[PDB]
């Protein structure tokens, strides 16, 4: 009986560490997750701004072209 | 020993702190700048209010209390209001850009820049404590903070305090008094991802608050000042067994046991009685026969639902004031013969009771009668999961046609969450049916 | 605060940013010499979010002046409120535009757009926490048209994570003779469908029709129509400027307005509305959700509302306003999309505009704004078709694939707006 109750209480324990453990590394995951999601968003967002700036250009170079 | 500390997040959490913190004040003559004439135990003690008021040297009794919000001015207005003598500065956190109403913003782009402050306050309340028994966490499901950074700090919390016990007491959104459209998909983003890491939450329904004020104050367009003093007080009858000490006083955590079958299943439905003005109560003396029959009246529950169409796994009876077990008795042998009360077939069915002699109070200039005594129902009724059903119905009509999605995606989340989210909602609304059909 | 960067290009934007500042320096208690003499703490409380405090407790205008000729400029800084704006906002070329969105977006406006970035981060870096920027321009034209969606690309590349509201004033052939005005409105839709968060339509073809049909003014002038404009931003943004629940920012208000990305574009109304040769609170409700009162000119009986905010001034029933507000859209549930529930948002603010004692605001994002920009490509197409006026264009160095992009790109942008009309729940 006298190790069916350290059996217990050990088990107890683990189950505690396991959740604690477990819900550590979801979040660590999720954040992770996030942040690279939104940085490719915004990533994505710039790379069309910069396509509209380098045909501004070619715009710019194509009448100088013409003169 | 056995403190309990309190997080109010967001808009509707903090204001309702703010309701609940002044009554509890009154409840134990505690003045404005602190002091508690009454206490003569200067710098400390183990009274029953101990559990949510620590004390200071100079007898300044300071709630166990973290306010924050993810923008500053419902915070500044606690800040420079009647009980800013209340608070200590550190207890009291603000940012600058709020979460625009989405739950992404509050979980991840905003909340994720504050989160740690956070946890640092809610540790330096937590070594104060002697017995720590577990966090009570007042937010809305619908705001951005209320919503998003509350499923963070509780999931934050449960890797810092394992499984101390964690209570919600939850603003479930209403469309007189609602400011987002979004509001259904916050709430279901927070109830699942919450769900694992709240071990009792109480729902309060915006709408079945807004109706009662209307309906037993007389209020025409009840603002959220009325909405809040009214929930204070069924907050306060749910607290009061923590703050309060008697003979006949029962510990939520007592009832708590009665009223959690399975880990999901932890949402009691609240009933309290009497709400009744000024002018109507300067007639009536209200008895326990009656206050306890109005328990039973659908139209005095915090949540819009059909009891009568579901089972009972529970029920408790909380009274303040002037009860004595005599009176008790005779009002509940009398409602089990003329009410509507099945309960399902694997749990027993008699009501557990509880009272507190301390009788309620009132703040002044309020809308609310004072009585000299009151009580608070919970029970757990499976009819509870009808504003699951609702809210789940508004989510699948948005999110059908992908309606505001893209606001959440741009702040880094997958449509995968929202699936994910629905998913363990209908689990959620399967497990109520379940619970409820009769053995085999 | 949460502050908002201002920013007016071209004579429109110029012209309709002027009255906006006018209106809401009244509201505010701010003299033309930038002092406080108002008698509220109401009118101070969120005053940080379009004004900065500068020494000697005076109010200046986070407004940024943009033109490529001197002229609208120089009439702003010698109207009624030019002493209130800050000298060194005010950034003018000589050149000017000669109503060319290429000369604007391409040519001289993309000369002088570095110096008007340059004036916007000084702002933008005394901000506690800017929220974003709103813009005042015409589509029409070829400052505000052509350099005004440049100023856009080029902040959003700056800002991404900022909110970028816009006032665009479409094109009408009731108000203006210029014949290349469908082209230059069609390309800058083109940039404002990728590029803005939010964008009220002020329709020229409605104010227009309201002077004259509504207002009997047989002669509307550009004052008569700006005065329109003037009353309708002042309502559109008064919950940004006073304390309040609904929509107090730029982002919680675009998370309301906004279900899909593209589908930005609002349609602004304001009651009551009668001549000046001639009210309950049921009566501001039906005034504000009828056509007649929109400032853009489309019936929105001709189509469905995605969302609508409802915004009502003065001292009023809030009870009579639930119950009016529940009363119109039961009666009239054909005309919102039963897949976004609880879609219309309704706010009041105790302090009325000048003149009236209640009043009322519209914004609505309905799919029958697809008329608006039908009327511009078919106006757009008449011309393209024969490829006429296209070497003022081409002679600047853009190539006709670019308005071919742009008809297709508002062309979807309609095909888009009657997908989700079409939708339904069941
Ligand atoms: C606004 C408004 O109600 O306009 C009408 C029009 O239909 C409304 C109904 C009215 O009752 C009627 C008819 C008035 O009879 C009233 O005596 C009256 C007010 C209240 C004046 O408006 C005010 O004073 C307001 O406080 C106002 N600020 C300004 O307009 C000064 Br920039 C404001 C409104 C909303 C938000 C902020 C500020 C305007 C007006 O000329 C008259 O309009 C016009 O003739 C007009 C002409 C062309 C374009 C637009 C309007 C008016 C005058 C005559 C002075
Ligand atoms: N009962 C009650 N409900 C409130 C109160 N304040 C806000 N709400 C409700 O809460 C929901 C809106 O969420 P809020 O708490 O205001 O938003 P938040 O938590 O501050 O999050 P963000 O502002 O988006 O960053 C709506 O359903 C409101 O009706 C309040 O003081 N009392
Ligand atoms: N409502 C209104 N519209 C204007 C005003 N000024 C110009 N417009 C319109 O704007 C278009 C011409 O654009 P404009 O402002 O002259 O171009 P820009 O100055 O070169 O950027 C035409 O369709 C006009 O009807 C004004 O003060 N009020
Ligand atoms: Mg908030
Ligand atoms: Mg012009």
Redesign the pocket.
Known sequence: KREHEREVIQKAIEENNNFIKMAKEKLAQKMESNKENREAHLAAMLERLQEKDKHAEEVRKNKELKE | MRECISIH????????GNACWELYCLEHGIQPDGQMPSDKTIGGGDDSFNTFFSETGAGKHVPRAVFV???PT?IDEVRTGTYRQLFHPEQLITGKE?????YA??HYT?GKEIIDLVLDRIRKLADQCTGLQGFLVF???????????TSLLMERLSVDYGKKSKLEFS?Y??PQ????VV?PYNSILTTHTTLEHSDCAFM?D?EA?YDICRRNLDIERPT??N??RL?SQIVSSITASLRFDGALNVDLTEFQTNLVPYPRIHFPLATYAPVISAEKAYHEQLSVAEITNACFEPANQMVKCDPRHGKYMACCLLYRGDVVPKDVNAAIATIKTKRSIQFVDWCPTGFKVGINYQPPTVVPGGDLAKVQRAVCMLSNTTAIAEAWARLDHKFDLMYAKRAFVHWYVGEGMEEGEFSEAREDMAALEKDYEEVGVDSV | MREIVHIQAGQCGNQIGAKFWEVISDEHGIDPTGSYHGDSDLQLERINVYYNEATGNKYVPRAILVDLEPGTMDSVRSGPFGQIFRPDNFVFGQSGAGNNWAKGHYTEGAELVDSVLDVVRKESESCDCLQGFQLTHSLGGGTGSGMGTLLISKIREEYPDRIMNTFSVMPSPKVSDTVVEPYNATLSVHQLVENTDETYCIDNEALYDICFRTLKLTTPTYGDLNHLVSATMSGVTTCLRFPG?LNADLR?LAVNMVPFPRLHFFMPGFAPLTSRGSLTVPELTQQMFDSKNMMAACDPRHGRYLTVAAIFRGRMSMKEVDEQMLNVQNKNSSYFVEWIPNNVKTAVCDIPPRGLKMSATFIGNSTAIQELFKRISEQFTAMFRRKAFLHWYTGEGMDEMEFTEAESNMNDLVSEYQQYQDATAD
């Open positions: 997040v967001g808009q509707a959490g903090v204001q309702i919000d993810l923008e419902v709020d979460a625009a109403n989405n913003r509050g905003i937010h809305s499901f619908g705001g951005g903070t209320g919503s998003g950074f603003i959104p209403a008094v609602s400011t987002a509001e309060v915006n608050i959220y000042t909405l809040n929930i | 629940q919680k």
